[PDB]
Amino acid sequence: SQVFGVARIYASFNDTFVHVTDLSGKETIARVTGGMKVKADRDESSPYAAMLAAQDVAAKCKEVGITAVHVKIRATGGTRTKTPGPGGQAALRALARSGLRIGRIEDVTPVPSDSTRKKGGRRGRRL
């Protein structure tokens, strides 16, 4: 009935990745980022840019044949913020309103078991 995919949205600060793959994940379709739609070098992480990026991922899926996607939201993770970027959540809304169908939403942010060391020094990033 429905041919499935994996949205694999990477919500981060300074960018946003939206690119669907196969159910295995090896073969990728329609990799477009937020920084490809707005020429600001600052609005890359903006929700509007991610919304425009999410539309292009959806547009290519119908041509390929994929009608529904699974969703995996991801933050930077590791020793970094672990909080999804501002535009990643807007990209998911654009994916759902573009005619595709959603199932099996999951948060896939990598979390360590108290990993090596966070950058910035002891006193922190004093700005």
């Binding site: 196969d22 159910l23 379709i29 707005v38 890359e44 948060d107 942010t109």
Partner: protein
Amino acid sequence: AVGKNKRLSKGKVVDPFTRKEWFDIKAPSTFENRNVGKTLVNKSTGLKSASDALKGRVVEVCLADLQGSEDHSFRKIKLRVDEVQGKNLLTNFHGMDFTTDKLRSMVRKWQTLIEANVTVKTSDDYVLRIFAIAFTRKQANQVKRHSYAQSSHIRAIRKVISEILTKEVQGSTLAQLTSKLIPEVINKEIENATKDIFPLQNIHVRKVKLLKQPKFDVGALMALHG
């Protein structure tokens, strides 16, 4: 962010989806649904052998999809391709895992988190690492607010659990385990051994992962996809 590329080539177009063919993913016999989905591979050329470019793939599927019931909503299942025949690429069990939200849900403070893992080998020489997790609970009528274990029940809890995990593995090759994790018989069996030690709510065991696999034995896999 668009017109800012200084250079594209260090030294200095064809549609890729006009040369791709879809396939069908088939789940093993110990699952209610077999139609996992589809995959993308280029057509096999003379020297490409696109079947070989597909054998090592691993696909993640929710157990609620295989069983059709959302009682296994979290219950992540990984299936590894082992054989390709006539558009019907065949997979075998590769590992079970928990969704992030489910594991983040059960871990609450003012209760003890007890974990145990084993390195037991199955009957069919599959080597598995089974992880078990359980949490303490407040008894009915309890007034104190944390209900912490005493780090000596936990050793007893961990020791008893490790015996259960290995025992249920030895004597079952790979499909009994796959058909034992579905009904959560181990989760119900763990509590009956640990109830007299301490309450231990939330015994949803944990992920299971394969360490090393035996010789391919193409006959065994075909015995599942009957």
